Design a protein around this ligand. Structure first.
Ligand SMILES: [Co+2]
Length: 112
């Protein structure tokens, strides 16, 4: 199961908005639980990953609503409104539909 992300890199100014995509090779929706098993992680310079959103659109505790996840099946999106300098990082989507979870290659976000 391959996880494809785009674009590879983004360079924007503070206050702008960005949208990144994550496409799964197989549908990640489960009709029994009615949940898309797709998560988004934020990885800051030299640190371990931080879970941001799970079940495609549900935010973790303390995560600002500037971060918005959406999509279902095979095509997902993570949107960041009014980007801030602190958001500088690499964002990864991760599927937990199968035993062995899989990560996408990520989208690097840099602030000008
Ligand atoms: Co999930």
């Amino acid at each position: 199961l391959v996880m494809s992300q785009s674009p590879s890199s983004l360079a924007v100014s503070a206050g702008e908005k960005v949208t990144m995509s994550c496409k799964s090779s197989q549908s990640l929706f489960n009709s029994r639980t009615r949940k898309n098993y797709l998560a988004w992680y934020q990885q800051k310079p030299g640190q371990s990953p931080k879970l941001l959103i799970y079940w495609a659109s549900t935010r973790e505790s303390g995560v600002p609503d500037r971060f918005t996840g959406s999509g279902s099946g095979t095509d997902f999106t993570l949107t960041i409104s009014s980007v801030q300098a602190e958001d500088l990082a690499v964002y990864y989507c991760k599927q937990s539909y199968y035993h062995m979870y899989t990560f996408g290659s990520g989208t690097k976000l840099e602030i000008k």
